[PDB]
Amino acid sequence: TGYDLSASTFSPDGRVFQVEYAMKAVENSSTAIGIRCKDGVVFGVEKLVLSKLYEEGSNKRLFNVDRHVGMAVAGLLADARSLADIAREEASNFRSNFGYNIPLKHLADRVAMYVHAYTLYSAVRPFGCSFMLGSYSVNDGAQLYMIDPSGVSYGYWGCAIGKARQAAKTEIEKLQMKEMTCRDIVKEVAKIIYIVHDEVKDKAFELELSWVGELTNGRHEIVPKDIREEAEKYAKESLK
Amino acid sequence: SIMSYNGGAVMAMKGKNCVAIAADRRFGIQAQMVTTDFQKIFPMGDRLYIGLAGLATDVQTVAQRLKFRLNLYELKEGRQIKPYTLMSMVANLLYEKRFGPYYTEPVIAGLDPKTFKPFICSLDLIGCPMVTDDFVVSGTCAEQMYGMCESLWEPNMDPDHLFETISQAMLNAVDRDAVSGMGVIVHIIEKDKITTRTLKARMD
Amino acid sequence: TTIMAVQFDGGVVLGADSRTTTGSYIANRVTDKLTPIHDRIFCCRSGSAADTQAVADAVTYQLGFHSIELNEPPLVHTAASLFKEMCYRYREDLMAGIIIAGWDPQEGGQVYSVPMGGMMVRQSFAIGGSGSSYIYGYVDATYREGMTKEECLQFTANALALAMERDGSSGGVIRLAAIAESGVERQVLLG
Amino acid sequence: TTIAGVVYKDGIVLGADTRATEGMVVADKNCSKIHFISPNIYCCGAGTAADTDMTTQLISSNLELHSLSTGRLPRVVTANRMLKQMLFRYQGYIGAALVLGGVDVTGPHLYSIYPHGSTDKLPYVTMGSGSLAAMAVFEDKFRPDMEEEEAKNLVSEAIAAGIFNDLGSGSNIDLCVISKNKLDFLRPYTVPNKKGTRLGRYRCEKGTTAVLTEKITPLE
Amino acid sequence: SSAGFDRHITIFSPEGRLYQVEYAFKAINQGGLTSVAVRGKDCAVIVTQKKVPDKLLDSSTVTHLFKITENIGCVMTGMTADSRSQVQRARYEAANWKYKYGYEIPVDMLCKRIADISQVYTQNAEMRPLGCCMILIGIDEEQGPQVYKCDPAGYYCGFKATAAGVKQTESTSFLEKKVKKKFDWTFEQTVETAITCLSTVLSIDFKPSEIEVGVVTVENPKFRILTEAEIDAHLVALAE
Amino acid sequence: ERGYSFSLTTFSPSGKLVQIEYALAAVAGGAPSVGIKAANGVVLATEKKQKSILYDERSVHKVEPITKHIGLVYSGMGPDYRVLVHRARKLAQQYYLVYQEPIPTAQLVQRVASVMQEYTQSGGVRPFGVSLLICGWNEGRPYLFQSDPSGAYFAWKATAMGKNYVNGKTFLEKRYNEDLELEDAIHTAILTLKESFEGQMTEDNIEVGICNEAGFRRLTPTEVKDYLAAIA
């Protein structure tokens, strides 16, 4: 009340309401989860068709930043596009200036500092984005990070961003994550997304699954989900 | 030389309790003189003068620039300037044009503002100061005035023999010189007063 | 002047002479021509002294900063890239005879070469300096693939010995460096 | 100009010859080229005198600033780094041949600076035009860890040989002693060359010169 | 006493206050985090707990002990973004010191530079004053180990028994009641007093998996983060 | 930043500058200090009470030299104090670059007060809540210059700034006089500081710097405990 206007001010109890308002902007966006196996990281985004007017394959929230890194955004889409352009630029700089692949820790820290700089002043607003960062390297393994609108960036095995933030990670943590390769984790993520919100609030959604790891030899791309078609034949066996 | 483009010779000489500075009057282009009353010795406050020799452009320029900074300092502080401070100021002003250099050899002569301590010093065209106790010379002709002053100087000199010594030295060393002559101005100062005499120089 | 790096299976072996000359006069009789940048990575320099000192200090700056921000030991190829960029970008003023060597936890021993141009190549052995041509004459004759450490030390001993003996600009004293997984072992052959 | 440095068993002895010539003429017979930096570090200059003077005064300002900020005795390596960085910024335009010596907490440390920006640590150096004579005296008669009188006599002998080769000085060669506690500084050390007393004298008279226009202006 | 806009920007209030900075002194208190430093003899000890309720969240990348340089460590409280930005600035000025001045930076000068940057942020308005508190530790020659604290306000100080975070009125009360008996601090004394003072504050008496212990000693001046095994060793060593 | 560049400090209908008056009040709510100019030297003395028994008195130093012959103390907030200290340092060294001579204290106060005045007028920044007490023994006669957040300055025979500074001032007017020595000035300075401080006053509660004609000196707690162990 009155203090919440500027992005430089503090409250009488000590927090910034601008950043909090930006955090709960992402809460109404689509649900996007992500989990790593012992030789790769798997993304997954519950994507929704509005009524009938989309094309099943535009505006994909699974981006692809580096040769081995891609983002899984949720929140404001154009803000996410700008953020992904910043990340592409930063990885391009590192590749130019040292001649090899960017490690995920340093990349996420540069991105976190950029986000923090947009949280500091009153000239700009905080971001409305919350995204995933996945990796694989033979000398590093699988790494999965996580960036809030404020700029706090650290690591996970599994995560979820959206409405079912808790409601997915309730049963994400009962997954035997270490002992599985990612080829099981594909249909795992499929059953997770399919379980949350089948028909109740909306009518139809649609699945995308990004896929990095040792099976891709360090490449990062979307699965040919249509190859091995793992959701639907398991989805119809997941309603019982 | 470019120092010999307009001639010029400035001699300073430290006496016992007093200091004598002299310079030549001639101004002109390389072979052609113009006037006999060009100014090279400038008053910087009381009991403290300065001499400039070389290219006359830089002479008048640096004279005005130093006068600018000196009046700025003397209005920022109610006291008058000490000669080491003036030497440092001239050094800074020359060194700012480290690669755009003024073609001048400044010679500073002044007494102590508090005591009757004399002071002489000379610089380079880039700002290398040098304090001595006998004499400092500048301008085109050097070895002439060096030989004469190393021939005629005594350490403890009343202003009269000081005047006669600097007079004979300047006259003979100028008469041997080619591009610099045409009258000599002499400033012989002390704690009590300021004397300015002009000599019947050979006008040849 | 004459600098030299040779890798073996476990690690690498470096080496240089001492004498820094100016014209025909020697200004410095004994000189650390090889420089520690990281604790596992050396470089030996040639050409101009001041240029290479400044470049090595800047590389020390950037590399130490980067290695602390990684919180991991740095790579050798990364420092090679740094010298490559610093040389190539602001060339036309420098005389760089930079040879990068060092042991790496991921990659073992490696040796990189940066001549006066600014190209970067990975070699198994390397020369550098004005009086390097002669021992470059026979470093491709005496070398055998798969040496031990003592063989590399004796190898560079003979090499820098004949380099110092034959060329006028070389001379002084032999400084050797042994970089491996274990530690850094420097010693000075004299007389 | 012949400056020389040495490291004895505790500290550093610096000497210099003080004939600042301007071309072919002896322009000075007493020119202090041993400059102040700090209570523990000094410096000697060679080549272009004005450039060395301006540069050493700038570095002395910077180190006074840094030391008064820090609150403890400065380090020689910091002065070395500042000088090499500045002279390399100037791309070798500024000609400044410097010899840097001081006693830190770590002990005595001597550096020589070549005006492009190349620097060395050595136990003894010579710089200047007649530097080779002092380098001869050193390379003849240097041994590690000398005593005090030994080092003083050695540096005096070196700059004396430099003076008996060309472009020395008439002067009484200046010396300087830096130790862990006792800083000393000697201008009139030893005069080998007395001025030959003139059996003249080239005398004059008080009125022997024609006067045209006299002026009197009193003061307070 | 709200005259003008003293509730919003960095202006002087009536009677001598300014509220934006003394709102930032409780910006540390939303962290829910507690940190203790101890310097009695030629070792210096940091201790700080974690709070990880998740099994999906990692443990390595959650540490607040931040190796600034090879001889200088630190720990952070408050919000994470301000802490990490302060961490990069500290590392950057340390490397700048090493480049300009030729030797290793002392922890005193570095904390003074950090406090100066804190003033620079404090000075202009339209700038958020970084609500994080920084404790630094290091060894200096001829002075031994050092402990410093940096405020958001730019008021640094250096002192022996040191604690900032949530509960440190109580911690400083314990340390007034403790650092008054004139015992020496022979490094097991230091570790035992640190863990037991945090044990008297929080009253949990817990596993070795929650607190991180940052140490530095005049036997190895390198900064050192303790391992689970030796933390357990000290923990059962004080278990009577 | 954007560079909005307007000043927050504008005139009242009374004609006052209420931010500057508030900054002066914030100074007056600060730690006490006393500075006395004697016949041969100048004495500076502050009053430094740590908040706990945990703090160390070897890291932060109130009394501060600017040159080897110019002491400087304050009564206000250290984060602003260190800034303008560093500014004065660089400024004095620029003077010593130009003129190759130690800068006089009047010249310091001119330049520092001009910088502080500039902060009073320039865009958006608050003024600095620091009241300096600058002094030094330049050319025989020693000086004593008080400044303020308003950019102004003065010259006192003796003064005080901080808590109950008017009470200390009224004790100074009766006790202090024109001519004493450095020791007697230290004596009456400790008297007027101990008139207003808390009861537990030791070798670490105070911090005393003097100004000889031999230069600025910063005394040690050794000689403080020599002297302030019941000086009267």
Distance (Å, whole) CA E39 – CA A167:
47
- Contact call for A169 and E56, based on CB within 8 A: yes
In this structure, are residues F83 and E116 in contact, taking their beta carbons and an 8 Å threshold? yes
- Between chain C and chain E, are at least 3 CB pairs below 8 A? yes
Distance between CA atoms of residues B98 and C15, nearest Å: 43
Question: Looking at this protein, which amino acid is placed at residue D63?
Answer: L
Residue D156: HSE in the Cβ half-sphere, 13 Å Cα cutoff: 17
Cβ atoms of residues F75 and F27 within 8 Å? yes
Residue F97: its chain D contacts at CB < 8 A?
A: 57-58, 61
Half-sphere exposure of A188 (CA within 13 A, CB side): 24
The size of the E-F interface in CB pairs under 8 A is 88
Give me the number of domains chain A comprises: 1
d(CA A137, CA A143): 9
Phi first, then psi, for residue C185 (nearest 5°) are -125, 105
Task: Centre a 10 Å sphere on the Cβ of residue C61 and count the other Cβ atoms it contains.
Answer: 17
- Kindly list the residues from chain E whose CB atom is less than 8 angstroms away from the CB atom of residue A115: 81
Element (H, E) at F165: helix F165-175
Chain C interface with D: residues with Cβ < 8 Å:
20, 25, 27-28, 30-31, 48-50, 53-54, 93
C85: chain A residues, CB-CB within 8 Å: 97
Class of domain B1-204: alpha beta
| Closest to F169 in 3D by CA, of F189, F150, F155 | F189
Q: Which architecture does CATH list for C1-191?
A: 4-Layer Sandwich (3.60)
Q: Which residue of C has its CA nearest to A105?
A: C70
**CA–CA separation, A101 and A84 (whole Å):** 17
Partners of chain A (3+ Cβ pairs below 8 A): C, E, F
CB contact set of E197 (below 8 Å; sequence gap of 6+): E36, E171, E174, E175, E178
F54/E172 CB distance under 8 A: yes
- Cβ-in-10-Å burial (0-12, 13-18, 19+) of A235 comes to middle
* The token pair that represents E66 in the structure block: 């931040």
Among B146, B189, B194, B180, CA closest to B25: B180
Where do runs of H (alpha helix) occur along chain A? 17-23, 77-98, 104-120, 165-172, 182-195, 232-235
Q: Return d(Cα A137, Cα A218) in angstroms, integer.
A: 6
Q: Is C1 a catalytic residue?
A: yes
Resolution of this structure in Å: 3.5
Q: How many residues in total does chain B contain?
A: 204
Alpha carbon distance F149, F25 (integer Å): 10
How far is the C-alpha of A154 from the C-alpha of E83, rounded, in Å? 14
CA–CA separation, C153 and C177 (whole Å) = 9
Residue F99 sits at the chain B interface (C-beta within 8 Å): yes
H helices, E strands: number in chain B: 4, 12
| Contact present, A97 and C62 (Cβ < 8 Å) | no
D residues 24-53 lying closer than 8 A (beta carbon) to B: 25, 27-31, 48-51, 53
Q: How far is CA B92 from CA B139, D98, F100, in A?
A: 21, 21, 10
Residue A169 structure tokens? 């990670």
- The answer for residues whose C-beta is within 8 angstroms of residue D84's C-beta and 6 or more apart is C50, C53, C54, D113, D117, D118, D119
Strand D108-114 relative to strand D118-121, pairing: antiparallel
How many Cβ atoms are within 10 Å of A177's Cβ, its own excluded?
18
Pick the closest to residue C110 from C132, C126, C98, C96 (CA basis). C126
Give yes or no for a contact between A161 and A32, defined as CB atoms under 8 angstroms apart. yes
Q: How far is CA A230 from the centre of its chain?
A: 21
CA distance E91 to B181: 69
Three-state SS letters, C108-142: EEEEEECCCCCCCEEECEEEECHHHCCHHHHHHHH
Whole-number CA gyration radius for chain D: 21
Give the residue from B53, B66, B62 showing the smallest Cα distance to B25. Answer: B53
Between chains, do A99 and C77 touch, taking CB under 8 Å as contact?
yes
> Which chain E residues have a beta carbon less than 8 Å from that of A169?
56
C-beta separation of A73 from A131 below 8 A: yes
Q: What residues form DSSP beta bridges with F210?
A: F43, F217
Phi and psi at B125, nearest 5°, equal -75, 0
Q: Is D89 an 8 Å CB contact of chain E?
A: no
Cβ-contact A136, A66 below 8 angstroms: no
Burial class of residue A207 in the structure, from the number of CB atoms within 10 Å of its CB (0-12 exposed, 13-18 middle, 19+ buried):
middle
**Mutation site for E-interface testing, chosen from F7, F17, F64, F82 by largest number of E Cβ within 10 Å:** F82
Tell me the helix, strand and coil percentages in chain F, rounded to 5: 35, 20, 45
Q: Using alpha carbons, select from A123, A36, A124 the residue that is nearest to residue A82.
A: A124
Strand intervals (E) in D21-165: 34-36, 41-47, 96-103, 108-114, 118-121, 124-128
Q: Do E84 and A116 touch (CB under 8 A)?
A: yes
Residues in chain D, how many? 220
Burial string for B166-185 (b: 16+ CB within 10 Å, else e) reads: bbbbbbbbbeebebbbbbbb
Tell me the β-bridge partners of D45: D98
* Cβ–Cβ < 8 Å for B12, B136: yes
* E13 closest CA partner among D216, F199, F41, F29: F29
Residue type, F84: L
Q: Is the peptide bond before D201 cis (omega within 30 degrees of 0)?
A: yes
- For chain B, what is the largest distance between any 2 Cα atoms, rounded to a whole number of angstroms? 48
The b-or-e profile of E115-138 (16+ CB within 10 A means b, else e) is bbbbbebbbebbbbbbbbbbbbbb
Does residue C138 contact residue C126 with C-beta atoms inside 8 Å? no
Residue whose structure tokens are 């006359």: B56
Asked if D80's CB is within 8 angstroms of E101's CB, the reply is no
Nearest in space to E74 (alpha carbons), one of E29, E121, E110: E110
**Structural domain of F141:** 1-232
Q: Which tokens sit at C161? A: 């010995």
Residue E9: closest CA among F120, A6, F24: A6
Contacts of F61 in chain D (CB under 8 A): 71
**CA–CA dist A150, A21 (Å, integer):** 11
Q: How many CA atoms lie within 13 A of B197 on its CB side?
A: 19
Residues with Cβ within 8 Å of E194's Cβ and at least 6 positions away in sequence, in order, are E36, E38, E45, E47, E213
| β-strands E66-67, B33-35 pairing | unpaired
**Contact list, C65 vs chain E (CB under 8 Å):** 91-92, 95
**In chain B, where are the structural domains located?**
1-204
CB contact under 8 A, D214 and B165: no
Q: Three-class SS string for E152-204? A: CCCCEEEECCEEEECCHHHHHHHHHHHCCCCCCCCCHHHHHHHHHHHHHHHCC
Domains of chain D: 1-220 (3.60.20.10)
Q: Can you tell me the distance from the alpha carbon of D141 to that of D139, in angstroms, rounded to the nearest whole number?
A: 6
Give the range of the structural domain holding residue A33, as residue numbers without chain letter. Answer: 1-240
Minimal Cα–Cα distance from F153 to chain B, Å? 16
Q: CA of F178: how far to CAs of E42, F132, F157, F181, F184, in Å?
A: 51, 22, 8, 10, 12
Which domains are delineated in chain E?
Answer: 1-240 (3.60.20.10)
Please judge whether D31 and B95 are an interchain contact, meaning their C-beta atoms are less than 8 angstroms apart. no
Return the CATH number at A66.
3.60.20.10
